[PDB]
Amino acid sequence: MNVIAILNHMGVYFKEEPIRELHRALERLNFQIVYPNDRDDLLKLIENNARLCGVIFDWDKYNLELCEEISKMNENLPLYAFANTYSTLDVSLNDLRLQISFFEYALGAAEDIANKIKQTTDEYINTILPPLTKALFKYVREGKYTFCTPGHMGGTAFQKSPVGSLFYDFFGPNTMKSDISISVSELGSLLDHSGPHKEAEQYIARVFNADRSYMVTNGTSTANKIVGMYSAPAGSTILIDRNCHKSLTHLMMMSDVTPIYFRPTRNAYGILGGIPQSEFQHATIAKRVKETPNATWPVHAVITNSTYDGLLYNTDFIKKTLDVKSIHFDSAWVPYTNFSPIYEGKCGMSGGRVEGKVIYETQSTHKLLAAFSQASMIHVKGDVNEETFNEAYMMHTTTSPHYGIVASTETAAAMMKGNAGKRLINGSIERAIKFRKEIKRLRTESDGWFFDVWQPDHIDTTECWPLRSDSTWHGFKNIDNEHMYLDPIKVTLLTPGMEKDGTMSDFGIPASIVAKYLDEHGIVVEKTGPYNLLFLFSIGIDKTKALSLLRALTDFKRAFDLNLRVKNMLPSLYREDPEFYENMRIQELAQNIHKLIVHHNLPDLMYRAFEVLPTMVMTPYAAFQKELHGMTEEVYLDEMVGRINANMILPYPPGVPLVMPGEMITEESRPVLEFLQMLCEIGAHYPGFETDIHGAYRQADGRYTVKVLKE
Amino acid sequence: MNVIAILNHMGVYFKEEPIRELHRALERLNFQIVYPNDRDDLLKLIENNARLCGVIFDWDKYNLELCEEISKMNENLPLYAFANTYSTLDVSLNDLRLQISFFEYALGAAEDIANKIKQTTDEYINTILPPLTKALFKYVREGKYTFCTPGHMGGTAFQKSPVGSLFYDFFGPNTMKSDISISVSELGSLLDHSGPHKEAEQYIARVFNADRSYMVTNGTSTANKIVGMYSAPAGSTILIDRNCHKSLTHLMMMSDVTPIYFRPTRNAYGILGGIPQSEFQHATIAKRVKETPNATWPVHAVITNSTYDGLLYNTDFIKKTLDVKSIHFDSAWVPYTNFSPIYEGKCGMSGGRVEGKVIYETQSTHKLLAAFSQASMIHVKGDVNEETFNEAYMMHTTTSPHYGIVASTETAAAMMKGNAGKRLINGSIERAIKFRKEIKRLRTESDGWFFDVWQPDHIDTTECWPLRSDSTWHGFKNIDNEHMYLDPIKVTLLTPGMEKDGTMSDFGIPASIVAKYLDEHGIVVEKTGPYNLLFLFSIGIDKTKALSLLRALTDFKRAFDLNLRVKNMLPSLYREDPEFYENMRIQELAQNIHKLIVHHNLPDLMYRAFEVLPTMVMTPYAAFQKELHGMTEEVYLDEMVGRINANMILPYPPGVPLVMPGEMITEESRPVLEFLQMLCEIGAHYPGFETDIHGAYRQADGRYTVKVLKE
């Protein structure tokens, strides 16, 4: 905030020489001065920037509707109207409700005007800032010597070493002084929820429409642990989504709990869809309790809302009909929910306080909002035992947190209050929708093949487009109406190779080549399956990045039709093994990997492997207990049927836990083994496209091993 | 189509004198010529008008993106690019896909260019017109003498009488020649579905996404009769909404059928809400079948979708779970459904062909679309007996229809194909939403009281806003989530008098005074209840009418705060009885009618009267049979308990059938009698606010009579 914009030169002297004196005084007060030519120049200057902290304009040539337009753009922005001809009498109430401060044109009075402008800018900065970030900035500005942890003590240890000086010159001084610990008593403490921290969690609670809100400093991988260790005591039972994270599996291995796994649907692409409506009612839950050993009525439920590919649920249905005392939504990919009414009825915090149960939501703030990594939140909705749940939160977090992460966690919510946050969210959603409309437009504009995007055939409104059973763009057969809602900002491109009914085509490009090409040209894809990409259109995405992406896709199309060699187009993949990719064209490589997928029948195996659940011999807690006692042997992959698995098997494709720790692959679940063997067989042909299975360990001969339990 | 717009004067002569010669030739060919100054002038000229049928522009100073923008505005509009400097080579495919015809700058060649322009305009007119309207216009243009019915024979009977000449000079010649009969063999016949008529019903079937579409010429009051006489044979049973029309009651009195009445919800305002989700499942339907005499499983269902106040249903739920073989949606108030994806999943024709049942929808085209009155449609979805249903359609319609109504019925759908219809529907919805946003804005801007509008507290997106159980703006208690969707274009204003929880305030204005004031100032309200208005924001509404309405509301507020006399402000109500309204102020009148509502407790009685169903002694067909035999006596209102009603009682407020023909008011339904007596008691005090009950007949002494059956 040092940019203060003065409107145009009227022409007469008595209201220009005071303006030039104020210019000189403001430059003396370390303010950059910009000179927009007219009104629309000011509108564009304010929307394209954010460092602007003041507008000076004459109240004669520009009326007070150029206070209201800026108010629609930013409510808290100070503007400085200069009163010459309009008297006191010419002011309405709506002018008085805006951030304007009136001044006069007097020669030699520029010093007091500049001091008042500096004070107003300071008030604006101290108004828009959240309280803990405000206090941290104040503490760094009054920077005191310290004799406490951390050891760098304001980064003055990095000023006395060469590699330390490189680190210090990279990061800069303010992010070294911002790292302090709980010994600084004026900032309170995260662990005890005191002072500026307590004001911060109350601020987070207002913003996100939650009763009590927490600010985790390790991540939602730890927030899931906190929620599932509070609400699910040992010996109890949980309803965990099979579409889960590794963190929930880790939680189940720490705690002595027992699962019933929900059964999500999926298409031939490998996109993890959702649980049908039948598996949230009392009948199916009671049945699955009945045929699970050592199982009682579930006391907690964990649901991934949304999925990895951005499929929201009808959460009002869930909160009405799921008859458990605590429903947890692992909303790691949807933290931005409250800030656009598009997502109404699509999170745990949507709607009011539900009766008889506590709704948890564990937004991963760093993922889609603007926050530093390892930042997360736990929003609750209901009544919880305050000391027990506070102690459970204290149990998993560290004792001396990184205050940069905490300040970023709060500043992410502070970016969403007012009109600026609504403008951010609506701009991101509208940009995502416009990108979707041209990618379907360029599909019908181009010749031959082009990238498809997995979205409804007619989208033109800003809403979460519901997945209807009467349409076939999604691919989930016999899907329930109003249970799924596509998130517009998680754009999933598609590549040729798949037909609409689910069978495979002949000409195709698997998405690994497209992702590697985009990585070569300096744009990064989130994660790819066999024939899909994913692009997070968060609040950071502007039209520069969107156009560069669209124009990396087009250059890939041109380079693939021209059929350039692997050496020229993909040097990063060429360097994987130059002997192999020396005389190979890209069309031959794409055709070869596509034929390896087709002949081995990848999508049918990937479907039929996840439509059958492995037999739960013992709870994953018992599997971890037997793993700790050294009762694990590494049998080869083929002889794994009838054996209890000790470590989780997580195959890419698709990215969802296939075999849990403690489950047996029986003869009824042989397509699981066929899929694993097929994936190992196809991954050992072409370098750079190596097999990515978390749990299976590569040997030298080419056959993988899985840690199973001894007999 | 006679307006052809030429872009600006370049300056050089060789491309101006041919343009002036083409100007002269086009004026010789009876084309009005407009001269927009530059590009944005042309954009505004095209959006503000529709009679423009051609743009002539130079291909040098204006590129071909000013073909694409006009294409987004109107796809079929002919434009005439003049090629001078850009050669053949400078044309892309997207230019070739547009309606441009290229010409050259040659002196003396303006005659052939003007003839080609006239031919292109004729092609454009014959392209955008629907086939039957095209053939009717062609027949009138080639206007032949006739010796057949109708008797005016092209309106030449009105040219020979003074009052006939007044009628002819009012209507004009083209709407007299357009009225012909089936004797003109080249237009086919509506009754037999032949020729241009058959092409018209197939055109209607494409447009509205229906299998077979019919075009009724009496109205949906007859279309309901057609559907319920085909699908519901005599001796069978129907599931008719209690929120029905008079036409459905008339249908039930013609046919020997038996009802189970659905039970809609309602708020304290008197707005007819909707049926809960529980009354569409098999259990409640089987129960209500079991305790109804002479009743079997229902073979047809009739549902008013939407209601009178624009509350759409989740029709996918209905078409999945309502286990009847034919579901009829009386969509008289929502005919515009297909033309914006906002209404997806909110009509009978939404989604695909449902299995095992036929979905009827009977859009009243004249109501919200642009069509002449008594126009209606019957869209089916499924398989019906073609000859039996065609004979049922022939049974109720006339034999010689008004071809103006038929042409208007088809032209209403023809207004919705292309980009112009989508622009109409989206403009109407956006205008409705913007009106809603300022009426809530002016509520918080004004002093004291202001008009409220019955809508969610936060609306900023173009969607049907769902009625959520976690909010209280609607007033329907314990409402089911995603069953109701507010239609944005049926704006229901509210007046002071009601609190948010349902109880009455002290200061209030009943909506009759506001409606009468608006009628005095030349704007018409659709229909009013006790404290609500209704404004149809159809495709006809532009911002002129919206601003005039908002500014009749504001002038009423100013005149009510100033407390003008009834004589000056409401002369039309003053003339009702000048002796009574001589020395009365408007605040006293509003306070008096509000106190009459409060002391008699109108909303509680209006609620408790419709929460209790009158006892069905006999089917309404039997009631009509006993009414025809002269077995009806007129007992007074107070002694009507224990008596079988012969004629329907339809009280205003609210506008929904309260007592059906053939039903008895028992001691369990005494609040019905209390509500009727209260309404008669309050309507006999203030003139001009007389009691509007259809069925109860006013006597001279002041006590009403209802035709009941003899004992």
Side-chain angles (χ1 to χ4, degrees), chain A residues 1-7 9-94 96-143 145-711, chain B residues 1-7 9-94 96-143 145-711:
Chain A
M1 300 325 89
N2 61 5
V3 182
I4 259 80
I6 318 268
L7 274 64
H9 39 35
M10 21 271 3
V12 295
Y13 187 83
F14 82 105
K15 52 170 65 177
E16 273 188 354
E17 189 66 35
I19 295 301
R20 284 191 271 281
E21 289 185 358
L22 181 54
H23 174 161
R24 292 198 290 264
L26 281 183
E27 283 180 353
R28 197 178 299 116
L29 281 174
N30 263 267
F31 277 174
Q32 180 178 356
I33 299 299
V34 294
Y35 280 100
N37 282 104
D38 62 358
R39 176 168 174 172
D40 310 294
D41 203 357
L42 179 71
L43 277 296
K44 305 301 279 186
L45 190 69
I46 294 172
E47 66 182 1
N48 288 15
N49 303 131
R51 295 168 175 82
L52 188 153
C53 60
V55 171
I56 281 166
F57 67 97
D58 193 298
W59 187 29
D60 292 331
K61 294 163 32 53
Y62 315 101
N63 206 8
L64 290 176
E65 162 200 300
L66 183 62
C67 298
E68 281 156 60
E69 284 176 348
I70 305 169
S71 170
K72 309 300 297 320
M73 294 177 70
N74 182 212
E75 211 276 330
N76 321 141
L77 191 69
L79 319 176
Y80 313 100
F82 266 98
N84 174 38
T85 308
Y86 298 101
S87 70
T88 307
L89 265 175
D90 294 324
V91 180
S92 66
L93 184 54
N94 297 318
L96 298 196
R97 292 197 159 158
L98 295 175
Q99 285 299 116
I100 302 299
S101 67
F102 294 87
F103 293 116
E104 282 177 350
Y105 288 116
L107 277 296
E111 294 292 327
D112 203 297
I113 295 172
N115 287 321
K116 188 73 177 182
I117 284 166
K118 176 72 169 66
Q119 184 174 358
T120 304
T121 303
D122 285 335
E123 291 185 20
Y124 164 63
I125 291 168
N126 287 112
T127 300
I128 61 172
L129 272 173
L132 171 141
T133 311
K134 185 200 302 179
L136 180 57
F137 287 180
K138 182 177 182 181
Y139 181 76
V140 173
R141 274 192 290 107
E142 67 180 7
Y145 299 149
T146 178
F147 287 76
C148 65
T149 187
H152 53 93
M153 313 200 174
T156 187
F158 294 103
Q159 295 181 358
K160 290 185 177 295
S161 303
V163 59
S165 163
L166 283 171
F167 199 83
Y168 192 89
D169 284 337
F170 189 81
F171 270 69
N174 281 321
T175 175
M176 322 295 318
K177 291 182 181 180
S178 75
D179 193 8
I180 62 170
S181 294
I182 62 170
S183 66
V184 178
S185 64
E186 71 204 60
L187 294 198
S189 62
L190 171 67
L191 271 300
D192 291 331
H193 308 291
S194 64
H197 282 91
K198 184 180 77 173
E199 278 135 18
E201 292 85 4
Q202 287 182 353
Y203 180 81
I204 301 306
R206 304 181 179 111
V207 168
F208 293 113
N209 201 0
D211 294 330
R212 189 82 172 89
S213 292
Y214 280 182
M215 311 185 327
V216 187
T217 187
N218 189 359
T220 178
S221 170
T222 300
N224 297 3
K225 295 180 177 67
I226 289 166
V227 171
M229 261 195 207
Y230 170 68
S231 66
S236 66
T237 300
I238 59 168
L239 294 174
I240 172 167
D241 191 8
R242 193 76 178 184
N243 189 358
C244 63
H245 203 69
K246 297 183 280 191
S247 55
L248 291 162
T249 79
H250 299 167
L251 178 61
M252 293 177 70
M253 299 199 293
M254 294 184 288
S255 59
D256 189 11
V257 293
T258 310
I260 296 89
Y261 287 108
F262 288 149
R263 303 294 315 279
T265 195
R266 67 196 44 68
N267 49 356
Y269 276 124
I271 290 169
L272 271 299
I275 298 105
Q277 294 179 356
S278 67
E279 298 189 297
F280 292 97
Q281 301 170 357
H282 194 282
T284 56
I285 288 169
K287 183 212 160 92
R288 288 178 187 264
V289 158
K290 214 163 71 73
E291 311 96 23
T292 300
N294 305 337
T296 179
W297 183 250
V299 308
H300 187 62
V302 176
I303 293 164
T304 315
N305 183 87
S306 71
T307 187
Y308 185 36
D309 286 282
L311 261 54
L312 299 157
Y313 285 170
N314 175 28
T315 181
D316 292 330
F317 180 41
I318 302 299
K319 294 189 282 188
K320 194 53 61 143
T321 69
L322 176 51
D323 291 331
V324 310
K325 57 179 63 60
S326 289
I327 297 169
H328 173 229
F329 292 100
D330 197 4
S331 88
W333 295 103
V334 185
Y336 43 79
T337 307
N338 194 327
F339 305 134
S340 64
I342 297 169
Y343 300 111
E344 261 165 0
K346 277 170 271 291
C347 65
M349 311 295 82
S350 69
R353 268 171 64 98
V354 67
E355 180 87 62
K357 59 193 75 174
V358 179
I359 302 299
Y360 298 105
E361 194 165 356
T362 48
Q363 308 181 0
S364 192
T365 299
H366 70 95
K367 286 259 194 90
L368 270 298
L369 297 153
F372 281 157
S373 295
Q374 304 178 186
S376 165
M377 293 179 183
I378 297 169
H379 318 288
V380 306
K381 189 68 77 73
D383 301 331
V384 292
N385 189 359
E386 291 176 20
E387 298 302 317
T388 306
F389 182 75
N390 195 13
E391 206 275 329
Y393 162 68
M394 182 179 72
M395 203 190 282
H396 268 275
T397 184
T398 187
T399 58
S400 60
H402 186 257
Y403 281 1
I405 282 174
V406 183
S408 192
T409 309
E410 195 189 7
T411 314
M415 293 177 70
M416 295 296 172
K417 274 173 71 83
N419 286 318
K422 284 201 104 66
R423 276 210 297 113
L424 273 185
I425 300 296
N426 287 121
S428 174
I429 296 169
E430 190 176 3
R431 187 172 296 118
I433 290 159
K434 286 153 76 176
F435 185 85
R436 290 171 175 262
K437 284 193 281 263
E438 290 157 329
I439 186 65
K440 291 178 71 68
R441 200 196 81 176
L442 272 298
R443 180 166 169 84
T444 61
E445 182 65 26
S446 72
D447 62 357
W449 66 274
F450 208 79
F451 304 102
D452 189 358
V453 176
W454 171 78
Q455 77 198 12
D457 272 7
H458 292 171
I459 58 171
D460 60 357
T461 175
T462 67
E463 76 166 359
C464 294
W465 308 294
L467 268 73
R468 299 184 51 81
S469 60
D470 291 331
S471 183
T472 187
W473 62 270
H474 43 91
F476 314 117
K477 55 185 75 65
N478 205 359
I479 191 167
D480 291 331
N481 284 292
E482 309 166 17
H483 182 296
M484 321 295 258
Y485 301 125
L486 182 63
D487 206 352
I489 67 169
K490 297 196 182 73
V491 177
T492 299
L493 271 69
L494 298 169
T495 59
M498 291 285 178
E499 300 302 354
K500 305 278 270 213
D501 49 351
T503 186
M504 302 270 302
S505 175
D506 43 18
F507 168 71
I509 297 91
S512 64
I513 296 89
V514 189
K516 280 171 190 79
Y517 172 72
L518 297 191
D519 185 74
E520 207 279 331
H521 270 74
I523 61 170
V524 176
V525 176
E526 169 70 45
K527 267 209 296 171
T528 74
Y531 293 96
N532 60 5
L533 313 168
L534 183 63
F535 304 73
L536 269 63
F537 278 154
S538 76
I539 56 169
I541 288 294
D542 47 48
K543 78 185 74 173
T544 300
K545 297 192 181 191
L547 281 170
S548 174
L549 161 72
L550 192 61
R551 212 261 154 187
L553 293 166
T554 305
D555 198 71
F556 172 70
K557 186 204 187 295
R558 182 173 48 183
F560 193 75
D561 273 358
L562 192 60
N563 197 14
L564 298 174
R565 309 147 48 80
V566 177
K567 175 166 73 180
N568 290 318
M569 183 179 72
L570 305 179
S572 64
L573 196 62
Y574 181 44
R575 288 191 300 270
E576 183 73 31
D577 187 75
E579 186 180 359
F580 198 79
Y581 290 149
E582 183 71 29
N583 289 310
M584 185 180 288
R585 298 289 175 94
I586 186 66
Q587 284 177 4
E588 202 206 329
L589 187 153
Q591 184 178 2
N592 279 327
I593 297 169
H594 184 85
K595 285 302 177 184
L596 284 180
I597 283 177
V598 167
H599 170 69
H600 289 276
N601 197 8
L602 190 148
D604 191 76
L605 284 174
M606 201 165 58
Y607 193 30
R608 290 186 290 118
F610 284 95
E611 300 326 289
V612 176
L613 186 73
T615 296
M616 181 166 138
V617 178
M618 64 184 73
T619 179
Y621 174 74
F624 180 53
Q625 280 311 299
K626 295 293 204 33
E627 166 203 1
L628 287 180
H629 287 89
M631 281 305 168
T632 61
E633 64 189 4
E634 295 190 356
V635 65
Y636 272 83
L637 183 63
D638 309 333
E639 283 274 270
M640 91 182 294
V641 291
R643 305 300 306 273
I644 307 170
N645 288 282
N647 275 322
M648 182 179 72
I649 303 168
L650 181 71
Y652 295 168
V656 65
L658 181 145
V659 164
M660 272 285 168
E663 293 177 353
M664 185 180 288
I665 297 169
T666 61
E667 296 293 328
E668 286 87 0
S669 185
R670 187 168 286 278
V672 160
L673 183 62
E674 261 296 320
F675 177 69
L676 265 290
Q677 286 168 355
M678 183 278 288
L679 198 61
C680 296
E681 278 165 354
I682 62 170
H685 288 175
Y686 283 93
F689 304 99
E690 301 174 355
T691 308
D692 291 331
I693 299 174
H694 286 74
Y697 314 128
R698 180 174 189 275
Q699 298 295 321
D701 51 353
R703 317 193 318 276
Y704 287 9
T705 61
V706 175
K707 280 176 69 172
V708 308
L709 293 182
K710 291 178 181 177
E711 296 176 355
Chain B
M1 300 325 88
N2 61 5
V3 182
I4 259 80
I6 318 268
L7 274 64
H9 39 35
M10 21 271 3
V12 295
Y13 186 83
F14 82 105
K15 52 170 65 177
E16 272 188 354
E17 189 66 35
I19 294 301
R20 284 191 271 280
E21 289 185 358
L22 181 54
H23 174 161
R24 292 198 290 264
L26 281 183
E27 283 180 353
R28 196 178 299 116
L29 281 174
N30 263 267
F31 277 174
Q32 180 178 356
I33 299 299
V34 294
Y35 280 100
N37 282 104
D38 62 358
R39 176 168 173 172
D40 310 294
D41 203 357
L42 179 71
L43 277 296
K44 305 301 279 186
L45 190 69
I46 294 172
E47 66 182 1
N48 288 15
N49 304 131
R51 295 168 175 81
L52 188 153
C53 60
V55 171
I56 281 166
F57 67 97
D58 193 298
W59 187 29
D60 292 331
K61 294 163 32 53
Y62 315 101
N63 206 8
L64 290 176
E65 162 200 300
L66 183 62
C67 298
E68 280 156 60
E69 284 176 349
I70 305 169
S71 170
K72 310 300 297 320
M73 294 177 70
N74 182 212
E75 211 276 330
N76 321 141
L77 192 69
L79 319 176
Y80 313 100
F82 265 98
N84 174 38
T85 308
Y86 298 101
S87 70
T88 307
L89 265 175
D90 294 324
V91 180
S92 66
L93 184 54
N94 297 318
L96 298 196
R97 292 197 159 158
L98 295 175
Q99 285 299 116
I100 302 299
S101 67
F102 294 87
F103 293 116
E104 282 177 350
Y105 288 116
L107 277 296
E111 294 292 327
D112 203 297
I113 295 172
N115 287 320
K116 188 73 177 182
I117 284 166
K118 176 72 169 66
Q119 184 174 358
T120 304
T121 303
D122 285 335
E123 291 185 20
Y124 164 63
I125 291 168
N126 287 112
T127 300
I128 61 172
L129 272 173
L132 171 141
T133 311
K134 185 200 302 179
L136 180 57
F137 287 180
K138 182 176 182 181
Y139 181 76
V140 173
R141 274 192 290 107
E142 67 180 7
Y145 299 149
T146 178
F147 287 76
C148 65
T149 187
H152 53 93
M153 313 200 174
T156 187
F158 294 103
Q159 295 181 357
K160 290 185 177 296
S161 303
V163 59
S165 163
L166 284 171
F167 199 83
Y168 192 89
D169 284 337
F170 189 81
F171 270 69
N174 281 321
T175 175
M176 322 295 317
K177 291 182 181 180
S178 75
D179 193 8
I180 62 170
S181 294
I182 62 170
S183 66
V184 178
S185 64
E186 71 204 60
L187 294 199
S189 62
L190 171 67
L191 272 300
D192 291 331
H193 308 291
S194 64
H197 282 91
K198 184 180 77 173
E199 278 135 18
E201 292 85 4
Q202 287 182 353
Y203 180 81
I204 301 306
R206 304 181 179 111
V207 168
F208 293 114
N209 201 0
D211 294 330
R212 189 82 172 89
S213 292
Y214 280 182
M215 311 185 327
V216 187
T217 187
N218 189 359
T220 178
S221 170
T222 300
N224 296 3
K225 294 180 177 67
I226 290 166
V227 171
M229 261 195 207
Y230 170 69
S231 66
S236 66
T237 300
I238 59 168
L239 294 174
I240 172 167
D241 191 8
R242 193 76 178 184
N243 189 359
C244 63
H245 203 69
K246 297 183 280 191
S247 55
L248 291 162
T249 79
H250 298 167
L251 178 61
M252 293 177 70
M253 299 199 294
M254 294 184 288
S255 59
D256 189 11
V257 293
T258 310
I260 296 89
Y261 287 108
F262 288 149
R263 303 294 315 279
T265 195
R266 67 196 44 68
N267 49 356
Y269 276 124
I271 290 169
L272 271 298
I275 298 105
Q277 293 179 356
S278 67
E279 298 189 297
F280 292 97
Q281 301 170 357
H282 194 282
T284 56
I285 288 169
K287 183 212 160 92
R288 288 178 187 264
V289 158
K290 214 163 71 73
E291 311 96 23
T292 300
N294 305 337
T296 179
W297 183 250
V299 307
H300 187 61
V302 176
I303 293 164
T304 315
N305 183 87
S306 71
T307 187
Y308 185 37
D309 286 282
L311 261 54
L312 299 157
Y313 285 170
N314 175 28
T315 181
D316 292 330
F317 180 41
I318 301 299
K319 294 189 282 188
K320 194 52 61 143
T321 69
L322 176 51
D323 291 331
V324 310
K325 57 179 63 60
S326 289
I327 297 169
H328 173 229
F329 292 100
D330 197 4
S331 88
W333 295 103
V334 185
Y336 43 79
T337 307
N338 194 327
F339 305 134
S340 64
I342 297 169
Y343 300 111
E344 261 166 0
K346 277 170 271 291
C347 65
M349 311 295 82
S350 69
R353 268 171 64 98
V354 67
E355 180 87 62
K357 59 193 75 174
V358 179
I359 302 299
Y360 298 105
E361 194 165 356
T362 48
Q363 308 181 0
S364 192
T365 299
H366 70 95
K367 286 259 194 90
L368 270 298
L369 297 153
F372 281 157
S373 295
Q374 304 179 186
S376 165
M377 293 179 183
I378 297 169
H379 318 288
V380 306
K381 189 68 77 73
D383 301 331
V384 292
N385 189 359
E386 291 176 20
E387 297 302 317
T388 306
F389 182 75
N390 195 13
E391 206 275 328
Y393 162 68
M394 182 179 72
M395 203 190 282
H396 268 275
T397 184
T398 187
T399 58
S400 60
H402 186 257
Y403 281 1
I405 282 174
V406 184
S408 192
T409 309
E410 195 189 7
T411 314
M415 293 177 70
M416 295 296 172
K417 274 173 71 83
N419 286 318
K422 284 201 104 66
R423 276 210 297 113
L424 273 184
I425 300 296
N426 287 121
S428 174
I429 296 168
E430 191 176 3
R431 187 172 296 118
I433 290 159
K434 286 153 76 176
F435 185 84
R436 290 171 175 262
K437 284 193 281 263
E438 290 157 329
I439 186 65
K440 291 178 71 68
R441 200 195 81 176
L442 272 298
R443 180 166 169 84
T444 61
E445 182 65 26
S446 72
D447 62 357
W449 66 274
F450 208 79
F451 304 103
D452 189 358
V453 176
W454 171 78
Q455 77 197 12
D457 272 7
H458 292 171
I459 58 171
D460 60 357
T461 175
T462 67
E463 76 166 359
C464 294
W465 308 294
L467 268 73
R468 299 184 51 81
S469 60
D470 291 331
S471 183
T472 187
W473 62 271
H474 43 91
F476 314 117
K477 55 185 75 65
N478 205 359
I479 191 167
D480 291 331
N481 284 292
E482 309 166 17
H483 182 296
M484 321 295 258
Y485 301 125
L486 182 63
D487 206 352
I489 67 169
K490 297 196 182 73
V491 177
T492 299
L493 271 69
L494 298 169
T495 59
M498 291 285 178
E499 300 302 354
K500 305 278 270 213
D501 49 351
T503 186
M504 302 270 302
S505 175
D506 43 18
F507 168 71
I509 297 91
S512 64
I513 296 89
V514 189
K516 280 171 190 79
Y517 172 72
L518 297 191
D519 185 74
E520 207 279 331
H521 270 74
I523 62 170
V524 176
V525 176
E526 169 70 45
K527 267 209 296 171
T528 74
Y531 293 96
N532 60 5
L533 313 168
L534 183 63
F535 304 73
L536 269 63
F537 278 154
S538 76
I539 56 169
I541 288 294
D542 47 48
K543 78 185 74 173
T544 300
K545 297 192 181 191
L547 281 170
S548 174
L549 161 72
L550 192 62
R551 212 261 154 187
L553 293 166
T554 305
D555 198 71
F556 172 70
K557 186 204 187 295
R558 182 173 48 183
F560 193 75
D561 273 358
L562 192 60
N563 197 15
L564 298 174
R565 309 147 48 80
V566 177
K567 175 166 73 180
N568 290 318
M569 183 179 72
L570 305 179
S572 64
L573 196 62
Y574 182 44
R575 288 191 300 270
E576 183 73 31
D577 187 75
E579 186 180 359
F580 198 79
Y581 290 149
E582 183 71 29
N583 289 310
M584 185 179 288
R585 298 289 175 94
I586 186 66
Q587 284 177 4
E588 202 206 329
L589 187 153
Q591 184 178 2
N592 279 327
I593 297 169
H594 184 85
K595 285 302 177 184
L596 284 180
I597 283 177
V598 167
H599 170 69
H600 289 276
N601 197 8
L602 190 148
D604 191 76
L605 284 174
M606 201 165 58
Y607 193 30
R608 290 186 290 118
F610 284 95
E611 300 325 289
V612 176
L613 186 73
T615 296
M616 181 166 138
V617 178
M618 64 183 73
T619 179
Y621 174 73
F624 180 53
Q625 280 311 299
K626 295 293 204 33
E627 166 203 1
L628 287 180
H629 287 89
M631 281 305 168
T632 61
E633 64 189 4
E634 296 190 356
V635 65
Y636 272 83
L637 183 63
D638 309 333
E639 283 274 270
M640 91 182 294
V641 290
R643 305 300 306 273
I644 307 170
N645 288 282
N647 275 322
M648 182 179 72
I649 303 168
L650 181 71
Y652 295 168
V656 65
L658 181 145
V659 164
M660 272 285 168
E663 293 177 354
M664 185 180 288
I665 297 169
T666 61
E667 296 293 328
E668 286 87 0
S669 185
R670 187 168 286 278
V672 160
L673 183 62
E674 261 296 320
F675 177 69
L676 265 290
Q677 286 168 355
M678 183 278 288
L679 198 61
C680 296
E681 278 165 354
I682 62 170
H685 288 175
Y686 283 93
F689 304 99
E690 301 174 355
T691 309
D692 291 331
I693 299 174
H694 286 74
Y697 314 128
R698 180 174 189 275
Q699 297 295 321
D701 51 353
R703 317 193 318 276
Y704 287 9
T705 61
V706 175
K707 280 176 69 172
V708 308
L709 293 182
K710 291 178 181 177
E711 296 176 355

